């Protein structure tokens, strides 16, 4: 069986026909900053091109979205006036296929589970540390979406009550402590000049004591948050991706692993694995979402 | 379809035939002190008695137990003498001639509140019980989340305060170690410099003792925070809170807890938080539902 | 017995002749951007001008500044160059009079102690919440220097292990939690756009939940850090100054006071007073630093 | 110049004549468990015996005692100890808190001898301290000065005997160690058993002990920002008699929390059990002078 995956990012759209194991085509175009109708047009035409290049029509479309979904309306809750856009209904009109929405982090989690670092497991938990912190939970490989589409909001577990303000409206969230933007927040504040993650990591590798303190602290919060999530979910394996975590200095991964292990004393520790699928994970998980929906429907 | 539920406690064994919605019988007997073999006989006998009293035989048995379970091996890995690493499942199956399905007592109460109690009508729910310890259970459509290794839904051991007080699990700052019955008694006894149990602590609270208020309200807020945090992971239909320590706490406790839960869901859709409805029978009901849904699902 | 007070700030320089109770003159001039040489010159110039304007000469000079300072050597270790300037010696050669150096936050503390909110006390604790958080300890009533001149660095007590990184090299310091720039750091992060303290306070007053959460948190950390310092010092009174604290929305002062009171349950709470001396405290304290040095 | 020092403890009373250099006599009598006026007799008794065994009279008496004190009244419970003892003995009396007195002793005679200022922390059953600035105890406006055990290190932390939570004492004192160990091991565990488990490599015991050690290091490093003392002195049987990993973890935390700062030396207390008596004596001796 064949489907089409779409990954709607903030900068680019990716599309590809997927046969259950592999992408038979891959199309990347920029994401329209011109509004909803044009976003939808570019999605439909990326799908069409992907199908043309694979020489194969998809029987369904999986759409990965860089926002939280309303699966009932079929709407997305840096892309102009996508908000409240009836993206599912529109794409289903244009395309004549069912459209299955998924959150981008849940999609990447689904991809690693079936095709990446957790292949072989029945359940897995995925965290991505990038600009923000997101993740997903796969339980017998389907995404846990929640009653309201808020399931798997792993960057917003509270790790430090009385901690730094979070974008979500709370404080001391994992994202507020350890995301790329939190790292830049704290670096810029502590060094009293704009410091981006690149500069922070440069400083870290040169042995700057302030940079070390800050980076290691963030690494340990991730390890703590993952160990804590093990008590909730007890996943076969834990997968960590996202460019901020994967490209971090080696001291980072060491500290994170160390904290995870310390916060599993007295417990059975799942293996913690690096994400394998890189930038294609969202596209693969969007396609898998459609694929598995068809398969189980 | 009929099954038999069994709830194995430190003091008492409960048993009853269950029809998918209601108990058809209810038998309560003391839990033996004489070790695993006698406990296993008491369980089988209580089962048979429940079946005689209901006039019906169950086709499976569900058994709820406090301990850490090995679901793999069907063994109980506390207040019950040399049930240690005891292979209850096979022994019970052999005695009874029925398949036996094991479940942790907190997971069992959670299943029961989901199907028969505070969360009836939901697809998913999340249950926390505050008693001597803190436990819980996660129900997603209509079945307990057990985890790859049976550690799923260990809701009392999420880390809420790094550098907090030592927990019995081997960590520190766990919800249990902050807010359980024994945690309150630990901190009240230290701070008052004399033995203070939860009864004396709650009297002091109701009398307006400043130190008692401080300690109780802080524990109430950690429960609110831990439940709000769990909503981000699970996004359950409803959150259910039970256990004797939370349910019988002063009214200021419940207010402070609810206020913390609402504050830690600013920016979020807050599931309803509801008092557990089933009381002392939740464990028996969930043990029965365990077997019922397995047989139904089988 | 007269002295001259000098307050060296980044934008302006204040000078004034001080008789022990009162300023007999007050001069404000801009702070030169040309480098140490000219700064020292402008300082000496404002000194004489104030002496003329008051119609009397001081037998000593007090100089207050925000720099990291070396008190034994009289060197300033936001003004253009300046790195390790021997201001004390240079001012002494150029002036005739002995020169005494004080940290600006210490000076403001001394002034509030002798002339301000803590007048009448033998000991007080002073905290100033501005862009950063500074402090001063007055026992009675002389500034606690410290053996290394690190005494009274009240913005750097650790309140939250594992908290936000501080400019000092630590984390979870009072300053890192509650200073103006820490407010701007968290507001800018959480709102995902540049938010300065003016905008944060505007949002706070319009009832924005995120702004309320963040500002009240910073308020409570101030109340906690002050209550905690009480255990160490048992000051006659605690004095809170700085425009970020004194000019914050109604709601902020009330949360801060409540946290202070909550963290002194079971204790005798010193009064927590609002600084009285405003923009002149640094000048008055520089004057008092010289005044009290002379008279002992 | 010669004074008498007295160290009123729970179990026992210590007394000794002091000449500004050393003790010339030392008596240890049990404290009257029953009656407050009998304790007052026993203090003058022990003072006389001390002066008998020394063969010298003291010009002043210094009295160290565990409770928080009222230095205007001269009372502790709420008993006119200063006035009585002045009447009963015929010498001026000077009161001091026990931990302050130990701080003063370590400053003039022990680990910090030679400093202008020092900071002392005693980790025992509770956590107490004293601040010494040149050469005298910081008493505070209300006699509450130097209550170092009650600095807030962990908001939302464990309830404290003082009425707060997350105080250094509530995190790291002897009773705090026994509180957490007894809870986590689910059986009575005193500091001896806890330290035995630590040395045996029990993971739970290591976690709990190292945490308390680090909190002491952070609290001392934080007090350095307020006081900038010449040296920091750590004593008490719980700190002094702890396993070696305890001291290393503490120092490491103290050091990490003074990154970017000049760290004062941290020194072990030298005077052991005589600190209190020696500091009571110094309290009298220094007040005379
Ligand atoms: Zn958040
Ligand atoms: Zn635990
Ligand atoms: Zn700092
Ligand atoms: Zn305390």
How would you characterize this protein structure?
It is classed as transferase. The entry lists the keywords ROK, hexokinase, glucokinase, sugar kinase, transferase. The assembly is tetrameric. The entry is titled "Crystal Structure of ROK Hexokinase from Thermus thermophilus". Chains A, B, C, D are Glucokinase. The structure is a homotetramer. Chain A has 2 domains: 143 residues, 2-Layer Sandwich (Nucleotidyltransferase, domain 5); 154 residues, Nucleotidyltransferase, domain 5. By secondary structure, chain A is α/β, with parallel strands linked by helices. In chain A, strand 1 and strand 2 form a beta hairpin. The first copy, chain A, has a 5-stranded mixed beta sheet with strand order 3-2-1-4-7, with helices on both faces. The first copy, chain A, has a 5-stranded mixed beta sheet with strand order 10-9-8-11-12, with helices on both faces. In chain A, strands 5-6 form a two-stranded antiparallel sheet. Chain A is built from 10 helices and 12 strands. Chains A and B meet through helix 7 of A and helix 7 of B. The site of one zinc ion (ZN) has 7 residues of chain B, from helix 4.
Bound molecules: zinc ion
Largest sheet of chain A: 5 strands, mixed
Q: What is the tally of helical segments of chain A?
A: 10
| Share of residues in helices of chain A | 40-55%
Number of strands of chain A: 12
């Amino acid at each position: 069986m064949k489907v089409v995956g779409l990954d709607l990012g903030g900068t680019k759209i990716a599309a590809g026909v997927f046969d259950g194991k592999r992408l038979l085509s891959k199309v990347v175009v920029p994401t329209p900053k011109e509004g909803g109708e044009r976003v939808a047009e570019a999605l439909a035409e990326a799908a069409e091109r992907a199908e043309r290049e694979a020489g194969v029509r998809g029987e369904a479309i999986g759409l990965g979205t860089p926002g939280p979904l309303d699966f009932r309306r079929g709407v997305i809750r840096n892309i102009p006036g996508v908000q409240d856009f009836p993206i599912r209904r529109i794409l289903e009109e244009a395309t004549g296929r069912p459209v299955f929405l998924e959150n981008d982090a849940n999609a990447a989690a689904l991809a690693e589970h079936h095709l990446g670092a957790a292949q072989g497991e029945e359940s897995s938990l995925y965290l991505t540390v990038s600009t923000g912190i997101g993740g997903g939970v796969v339980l017998g490989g389907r995404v846990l979406r929640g009653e309201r589409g808020q399931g798997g909001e792993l960057g917003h577990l509270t790790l430090l009550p009385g901690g730094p303000a979070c974008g979500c409206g709370l404080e001391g969230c994992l994202e507020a402590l350890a995301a790329g933007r939190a790292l830049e927040r704290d670096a810029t504040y502590a060094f009293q000049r704009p410091v981006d993650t690149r500069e922070l990591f440069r400083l870290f590798q040169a042995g700057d004591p302030k940079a070390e303190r800050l980076v290691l602290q963030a690494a340990r919060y991730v390890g703590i948050g993952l160990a804590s999530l093990v008590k909730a979910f007890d996943p076969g394996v834990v997968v960590l991706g996202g460019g901020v975590a994967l490209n971090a200095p080696e001291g980072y991964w060491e500290a994170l692993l160390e904290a995870y292990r310390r916060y599993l004393q007295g417990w059975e520790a799942p293996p913690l694995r690096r994400a394998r699928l890189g930038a294609e994970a969202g596209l693969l998980g969007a396609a898998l979402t459609a694929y598995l929906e068809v398969k189980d429907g």
